Amino acid sequence: GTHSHGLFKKLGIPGPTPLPFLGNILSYHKGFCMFDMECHKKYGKVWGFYDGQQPVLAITDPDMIKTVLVKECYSVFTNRRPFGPVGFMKSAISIAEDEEWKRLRSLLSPTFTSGKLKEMVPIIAQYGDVLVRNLRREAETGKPVTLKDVFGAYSMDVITSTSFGVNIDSLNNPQDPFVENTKKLLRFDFLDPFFLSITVFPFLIPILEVLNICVFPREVTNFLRKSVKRMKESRLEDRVDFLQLMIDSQNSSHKALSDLELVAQSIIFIFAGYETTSSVLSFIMYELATHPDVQQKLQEEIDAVLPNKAPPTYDTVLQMEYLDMVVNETLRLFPIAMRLERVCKKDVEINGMFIPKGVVVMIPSYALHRDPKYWTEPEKFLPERFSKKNKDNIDPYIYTPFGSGPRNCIGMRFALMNMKLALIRVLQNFSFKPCKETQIPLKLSLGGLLQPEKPVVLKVESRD
Amino acid sequence: GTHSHGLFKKLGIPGPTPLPFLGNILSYHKGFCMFDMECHKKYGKVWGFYDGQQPVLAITDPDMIKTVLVKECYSVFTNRRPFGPVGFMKSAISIAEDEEWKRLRSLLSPTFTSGKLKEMVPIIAQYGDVLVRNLRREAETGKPVTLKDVFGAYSMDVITSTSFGVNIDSLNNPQDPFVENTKKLLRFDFLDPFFLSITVFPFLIPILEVLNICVFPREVTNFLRKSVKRMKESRLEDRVDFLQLMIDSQNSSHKALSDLELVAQSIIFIFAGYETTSSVLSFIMYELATHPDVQQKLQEEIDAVLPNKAPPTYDTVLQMEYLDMVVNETLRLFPIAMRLERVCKKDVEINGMFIPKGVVVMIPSYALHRDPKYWTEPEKFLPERFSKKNKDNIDPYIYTPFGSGPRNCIGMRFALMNMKLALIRVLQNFSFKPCKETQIPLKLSLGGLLQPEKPVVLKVESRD
Ligand code: HEM
Ligand code: HEM
Ligand SMILES: CCCCNc1ccc2c3c(cccc13)C(=O)N(CCCC)C2=O
Ligand SMILES: CCCCNc1ccc2c3c(cccc13)C(=O)N(CCCC)C2=O
């Protein structure tokens, strides 16, 4: 039960001693983030641990992190940890490996250009207005509002319309078969029973693939596959969404995106942007209600750029420095990816350190973001860290809320524009105050997702 | 049960239609060799079939075969089919993959040079004499002789002494712990129940690895590991064998052969040279007893080069053209590897044919060796095919008894020198005649090893 549990003693690398079979998973009782803080404080710059039989080497050195995420990305550190039975979703860009990934990123990167993005702002902006009208009636009511649900619906509306050209008010159509399915595409909690068991029993993943058992519920994938097949066959008789952009890239080097590859990207885009965007949007409105100074300052900035509740535009969005500072400071405190990982594909020596084939090199983003050594008052919400007076003292490989290098988040600038468009229209119309249900201070789940312990609820007063 | 069973219909490639789950394995009731002849005759140049869910594309075109075994060996077609739970034997050169294999072949090729080989002939030659004295007493007795056993013991003696510097008369020491274990390293019958089940249930191989269950009986591997560890620790206090040559290459580019890598090569060498050498030596003496003309002609050639029962030498061995013709013609009829295989590592187009990632490209050596289109009277034993008058009409990619290109048999010229040294000393002293037990004509097993149906027995008369 300890065939590989000797690797870090032999390489001289420190860390918590592993138990036969389990590795260090019982140390996850407090969640990925507490585990990474404790190891960092205890073992220092570099340390190892075992997810079952799987050795994970954590690195915290900015120069080492860059070699991994940027320098030897293609040569050595190309892929993330395989994580369970995955079926045809093996070809979604976030899961594909080595040369297939590079072909998919080349094929899909033209779809996330700033040019295409500002062509999508009129679509996103429309559901900002839907978000507002939904919020006002739950404000005129005066009853506390669950951000998870108002911003979930917003994020869904922006995916349904920019991904597929489907226009739904999901908040007022929770039974549209398109909403019911897509709502099921939540992010994975790698500390829940199924994934914990998979971690101790990875030899069982090939058995689940053969039974077409899949972490993506084949009930929802099947729906979307046949949905996309329908949109693909319609339209062609008679738009600026992701699906169309992928239909078009099938008409030119690299082999055009096959029909099933295409569907796989549509799905992963949903999975990668849905519960993420809503989690950040909720964390941000949590900090704005517990720091009224900042909320007022931001409402003041928005009103100056968009006088008279003027509708936001791509260009007026990139203008708002304080809004950028607020978004960023929220992502420092709550980097919802928690860790970046890369599989070491071959024996290497980066920065004087020998990394053997097979190890999972992991960057504890949550921990580096709250390290005393780089950040004053590291638990405080303090947007002035990202003022231009201060943002140059910030290491791009310490602050990695979207990752770094060729395999960073391909939807970053889309996700930032989307969240800010939401915030502008929400703050033009409303102020957000705490309640008695409001967990102050916010507690994070001990699970495997960086999310509040209990969901966040707030007062929403109308400014008019 | 037919997720991949549609590949050859879609690519336009012909072949026998597969059954859910099984693929075409039930067609193996007649053995690998009959299956390959029937498909060749029926589907022609190229055809596909499924070993369980595993698609195998057979190719018979000499130009296509060369692209696979020679041209795109490193780029595309580097590795053989994985075949079962294999433990630490994952690093033996015949099993290792991609860049690890290339490092091992670079490290071990200097050990199979002609220079080192003629330095080993005095060792091999010694057990030729042991073979003779063993044969004479079973000849003076007059009782039929089982070649499997006389040549098994010969091959063992040559491995024990050239591999490890261990000198045993295995025929007269069947209880030496070193003989008992090494005798257990027989070749795999991929049509026996365990490997058939593995072929239908490959998703179970990771479960067997985790239980340290291994196709190499960990009872024998453990013995040799600790044996080599002993020879390694002895000697060093106080030789021209393979082990020493590997000890020496650990003292220089590529990282020297680690202690466990070294042991893995020692073992695989045994597995690759033991039952192979004895099978060919037995097939050859079968043809010499059923073609007395050829046996006399060869005895005549040997006596001319080595007058007065003179002991053979490296240089007098490469002299004997008829002996070379006999060995080669026997290997045509009985290429004991039966097939060469390479895994297609990425989508390629060789010779106008699209090969997708994952397919096992297989070369039916047995079948090409008995193809009417290249060979007159293809079932006849006719050594004059390899006379210099005729051997230029022979395609090196049709006749592939040791494979071809960078991944051919690294012990070829050793195995040829070894078999010929055996034949010379045996034919200087004895003539071999059939018996009534002698299966005429020889029938091949319907199993997965190319071997006689019933073992071969012969009269052995002394020439003096
Ligand atoms: C606030 C919202 C989001 C955050 C914080 C976020 C964060 C991240 C992080 C940390 C990574 C890992 C990159 C690495 O390993 O270095 C990632 C990858 C990725 N993200 Fe985002 N993401 C967000 C929203 C989105 C959206 C809206 C999309 C697309 C519509 C998206 C698509 C992807 C994809 C496809 C990957 C995998 C990229 C690849 O492997 O090539 N994400 N994300
Ligand atoms: C008559 C005796 C033998 C025959 C007919 C034979 C035949 C073969 C064949 C057909 C291959 C496959 C090559 C390919 O895939 O193209 C092979 C590989 C190999 N043989 Fe032999 N072999 C014999 C004896 C030996 C001996 C004596 C040794 C070493 C002592 C040996 C070591 C190997 C090894 C290590 C491989 C794998 C090479 C690699 O993957 O790099 N064989 N053999
Ligand atoms: C063989 C599969 C075992 C399944 N098990 C895990 C799968 C994936 C991950 C994983 C992680 C920890 C423990 C188990 C697994 C992990 O940190 N990450 C990085 C993202 C941070 C939240 C993973 O992608
Ligand atoms: C996933 C493992 C399934 C096990 N099963 C087989 C393993 C290996 C081979 C194999 C073959 C046929 C059918 C099953 C397997 C085969 O032809 N060769 C080439 C050598 C010719 C005798 C193999 O190395």
Side-chain angles (χ1 to χ4, degrees), chain B residues 297 301 320-330 332 375 381-395 399:
Chain B
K297 191 151 190 251
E301 172 169 86
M320 308 197 178
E321 287 181 13
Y322 198 70
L323 169 75
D324 195 60
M325 293 162 52
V326 169
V327 168
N328 289 347
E329 173 64 346
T330 313
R332 193 196 57 96
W375 313 96
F381 178 75
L382 285 178
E384 291 288 333
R385 305 181 198 270
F386 295 83
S387 76
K388 300 181 179 174
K389 166 195 126 49
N390 290 334
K391 68 184 196 166
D392 40 293
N393 289 337
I394 287 195
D395 217 314
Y399 176 72

Coordinates of all heavy atoms in Angstrom, one line a residue, chain B residues 297 301 320-330 332 375 381-395 399:
Chain B
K297 N 24.2 -32.9 -47.0 CA 24.9 -31.7 -47.6 C 25.5 -30.8 -46.5 O 26.6 -30.3 -46.6 CB 23.9 -31.0 -48.5 CG 24.6 -29.9 -49.3 CD 23.8 -29.7 -50.6 CE 24.6 -28.8 -51.6 NZ 24.1 -27.4 -51.7
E301 N 29.3 -29.8 -45.5 CA 29.9 -28.5 -45.5 C 30.6 -28.3 -44.2 O 31.8 -27.8 -44.2 CB 28.8 -27.4 -45.6 CG 29.3 -26.0 -45.3 CD 28.3 -24.9 -45.7 OE1 27.4 -24.5 -44.9 OE2 28.4 -24.3 -46.9
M320 N 29.8 -20.6 -43.3 CA 29.1 -21.8 -43.7 C 27.8 -21.3 -44.4 O 26.8 -21.2 -43.7 CB 28.8 -22.7 -42.6 CG 30.1 -23.0 -41.8 SD 29.9 -24.5 -40.8 CE 31.5 -24.7 -40.1
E321 N 27.8 -21.2 -45.7 CA 26.6 -20.6 -46.4 C 25.4 -21.5 -46.3 O 24.3 -21.1 -46.2 CB 27.0 -20.3 -47.8 CG 27.9 -19.1 -48.0 CD 28.2 -18.8 -49.4 OE1 27.5 -19.4 -50.3 OE2 29.1 -18.0 -49.7
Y322 N 25.7 -22.8 -46.5 CA 24.5 -23.7 -46.5 C 23.8 -23.8 -45.1 O 22.6 -23.7 -45.1 CB 24.9 -25.2 -46.9 CG 23.8 -26.0 -47.3 CD1 23.1 -25.8 -48.6 CD2 23.3 -27.1 -46.6 CE1 22.0 -26.6 -49.0 CE2 22.2 -27.9 -47.0 CZ 21.6 -27.6 -48.2 OH 20.5 -28.4 -48.6
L323 N 24.6 -23.8 -44.1 CA 24.1 -23.6 -42.7 C 23.3 -22.4 -42.6 O 22.2 -22.4 -42.0 CB 25.3 -23.7 -41.7 CG 25.0 -23.3 -40.3 CD1 24.3 -24.4 -39.5 CD2 26.3 -23.0 -39.6
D324 N 23.8 -21.2 -43.1 CA 23.0 -20.0 -43.1 C 21.7 -20.2 -43.9 O 20.6 -19.8 -43.4 CB 23.8 -18.9 -43.6 CG 23.1 -17.5 -43.3 OD1 23.0 -17.2 -42.1 OD2 22.8 -16.8 -44.3
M325 N 21.7 -20.9 -45.0 CA 20.5 -21.1 -45.8 C 19.5 -22.0 -45.1 O 18.3 -21.9 -45.2 CB 20.9 -21.8 -47.1 CG 21.7 -20.9 -48.1 SD 22.6 -21.8 -49.4 CE 21.3 -22.9 -50.1
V326 N 20.0 -23.0 -44.3 CA 19.1 -23.9 -43.6 C 18.4 -23.2 -42.5 O 17.2 -23.3 -42.3 CB 19.9 -25.2 -43.1 CG1 19.0 -26.0 -42.2 CG2 20.4 -26.0 -44.2
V327 N 19.2 -22.5 -41.6 CA 18.6 -21.7 -40.5 C 17.5 -20.8 -41.1 O 16.4 -20.7 -40.6 CB 19.7 -20.9 -39.8 CG1 19.1 -19.9 -38.9 CG2 20.7 -21.8 -39.1
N328 N 17.9 -20.0 -42.1 CA 17.0 -19.0 -42.7 C 15.7 -19.7 -43.2 O 14.6 -19.2 -42.9 CB 17.6 -18.2 -43.7 CG 18.7 -17.3 -43.1 OD1 18.7 -17.1 -41.9 ND2 19.5 -16.7 -44.0
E329 N 15.9 -20.8 -44.0 CA 14.7 -21.4 -44.6 C 13.8 -22.0 -43.5 O 12.6 -21.9 -43.6 CB 15.1 -22.5 -45.6 CG 14.0 -23.4 -46.1 CD 12.9 -22.6 -47.0 OE1 12.9 -21.4 -46.9 OE2 12.1 -23.3 -47.6
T330 N 14.4 -22.5 -42.4 CA 13.6 -22.9 -41.3 C 12.8 -21.7 -40.7 O 11.7 -21.8 -40.2 CB 14.4 -23.5 -40.2 OG1 15.3 -24.5 -40.8 CG2 13.5 -24.2 -39.2
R332 N 11.8 -19.0 -42.2 CA 10.7 -18.7 -43.1 C 9.5 -19.5 -42.7 O 8.4 -18.9 -42.4 CB 11.1 -18.9 -44.6 CG 10.1 -18.3 -45.6 CD 10.3 -18.9 -47.0 NE 10.1 -20.3 -47.0 CZ 9.0 -21.0 -47.3 NH1 7.9 -20.3 -47.6 NH2 9.0 -22.3 -47.3
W375 N 6.5 -16.6 -52.9 CA 7.3 -17.8 -52.7 C 6.8 -18.9 -53.6 O 5.6 -19.3 -53.4 CB 7.3 -18.2 -51.3 CG 7.6 -17.2 -50.3 CD1 6.7 -16.5 -49.6 CD2 8.9 -16.7 -49.8 NE1 7.3 -15.6 -48.7 CE2 8.6 -15.8 -48.8 CE3 10.2 -17.1 -50.1 CZ2 9.7 -15.1 -48.2 CZ3 11.2 -16.4 -49.5 CH2 11.0 -15.5 -48.5
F381 N 10.0 -27.2 -47.7 CA 11.3 -26.9 -47.1 C 12.4 -26.9 -48.2 O 12.6 -28.0 -48.8 CB 11.7 -27.8 -46.0 CG 13.0 -27.6 -45.4 CD1 13.2 -26.5 -44.5 CD2 14.1 -28.4 -45.7 CE1 14.5 -26.3 -44.0 CE2 15.3 -28.2 -45.1 CZ 15.5 -27.2 -44.2
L382 N 12.9 -25.8 -48.6 CA 13.7 -25.6 -49.8 C 14.8 -24.6 -49.5 O 14.7 -23.4 -49.9 CB 12.9 -25.2 -51.0 CG 12.0 -26.2 -51.7 CD1 11.3 -25.5 -52.8 CD2 12.9 -27.3 -52.2
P383 N 15.9 -25.0 -48.9 CA 17.0 -24.0 -48.5 C 17.6 -23.3 -49.7 O 18.1 -22.2 -49.5 CB 18.0 -24.9 -47.8 CG 17.3 -26.1 -47.4 CD 16.3 -26.4 -48.5
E384 N 17.5 -23.8 -50.9 CA 18.1 -23.1 -52.0 C 17.5 -21.8 -52.3 O 18.0 -21.0 -53.1 CB 18.1 -24.0 -53.3 CG 19.0 -25.2 -53.2 CD 20.5 -24.8 -53.2 OE1 20.9 -23.8 -53.9 OE2 21.3 -25.6 -52.7
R385 N 16.3 -21.4 -51.7 CA 15.8 -20.1 -51.8 C 16.8 -19.1 -51.3 O 16.8 -17.9 -51.8 CB 14.5 -19.9 -50.9 CG 13.4 -20.9 -51.2 CD 12.3 -20.5 -50.2 NE 11.3 -21.6 -50.1 CZ 10.3 -21.8 -50.9 NH1 10.0 -20.9 -51.9 NH2 9.5 -22.8 -50.7
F386 N 17.6 -19.4 -50.3 CA 18.5 -18.5 -49.7 C 20.0 -18.7 -50.3 O 20.9 -18.2 -49.7 CB 18.5 -18.6 -48.2 CG 17.2 -18.1 -47.6 CD1 16.1 -18.9 -47.6 CD2 17.1 -16.8 -47.2 CE1 14.9 -18.5 -47.1 CE2 15.9 -16.3 -46.7 CZ 14.8 -17.2 -46.6
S387 N 20.1 -19.4 -51.4 CA 21.4 -19.4 -52.1 C 21.6 -18.0 -52.6 O 20.6 -17.2 -52.9 CB 21.4 -20.4 -53.2 OG 20.7 -20.0 -54.3
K388 N 22.8 -17.6 -52.8 CA 23.1 -16.2 -53.3 C 22.6 -16.1 -54.8 O 22.3 -15.0 -55.2 CB 24.6 -16.0 -53.2 CG 25.0 -16.0 -51.8 CD 26.4 -15.8 -51.5 CE 26.6 -15.8 -50.0 NZ 28.0 -15.7 -49.5
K389 N 22.4 -17.2 -55.5 CA 21.7 -17.1 -56.7 C 20.3 -16.6 -56.6 O 19.8 -15.9 -57.5 CB 21.7 -18.6 -57.4 CG 20.7 -18.7 -58.5 CD 20.5 -20.2 -58.8 CE 19.0 -20.6 -58.8 NZ 18.2 -19.6 -59.6
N390 N 19.6 -16.9 -55.4 CA 18.2 -16.6 -55.3 C 17.9 -15.6 -54.2 O 16.8 -15.0 -54.2 CB 17.4 -17.9 -55.0 CG 17.3 -18.8 -56.1 OD1 17.4 -18.4 -57.3 ND2 17.1 -20.1 -55.9
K391 N 18.8 -15.3 -53.3 CA 18.4 -14.5 -52.1 C 18.1 -13.0 -52.4 O 17.5 -12.3 -51.6 CB 19.4 -14.6 -51.0 CG 20.7 -14.0 -51.3 CD 21.6 -14.3 -50.1 CE 22.9 -13.5 -50.1 NZ 23.5 -13.6 -48.8
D392 N 18.6 -12.5 -53.6 CA 18.3 -11.2 -54.0 C 16.9 -10.9 -54.4 O 16.4 -9.8 -54.2 CB 19.3 -10.7 -55.1 CG 19.5 -11.8 -56.1 OD1 20.1 -12.8 -55.8 OD2 19.1 -11.6 -57.3
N393 N 16.2 -12.0 -54.8 CA 14.7 -11.8 -55.1 C 13.9 -11.9 -53.8 O 12.6 -12.1 -53.9 CB 14.3 -12.9 -56.1 CG 14.8 -12.7 -57.5 OD1 15.2 -11.6 -57.8 ND2 14.9 -13.8 -58.2
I394 N 14.4 -11.7 -52.6 CA 13.8 -11.8 -51.4 C 13.6 -10.4 -50.7 O 14.6 -9.7 -50.5 CB 14.5 -12.8 -50.4 CG1 14.4 -14.2 -50.9 CG2 14.0 -12.6 -49.0 CD1 14.8 -15.2 -49.9
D395 N 12.3 -10.1 -50.4 CA 12.0 -8.8 -49.9 C 12.3 -8.7 -48.4 O 11.7 -9.5 -47.6 CB 10.6 -8.4 -50.2 CG 10.4 -6.9 -50.5 OD1 10.9 -6.1 -49.7 OD2 9.7 -6.6 -51.5
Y399 N 10.1 -11.0 -45.6 CA 10.7 -12.0 -44.7 C 11.2 -11.3 -43.5 O 12.3 -10.7 -43.5 CB 11.9 -12.7 -45.5 CG 12.7 -13.7 -44.7 CD1 12.2 -15.0 -44.3 CD2 14.0 -13.4 -44.4 CE1 12.9 -15.9 -43.6 CE2 14.8 -14.3 -43.7 CZ 14.2 -15.6 -43.3 OH 15.0 -16.5 -42.6

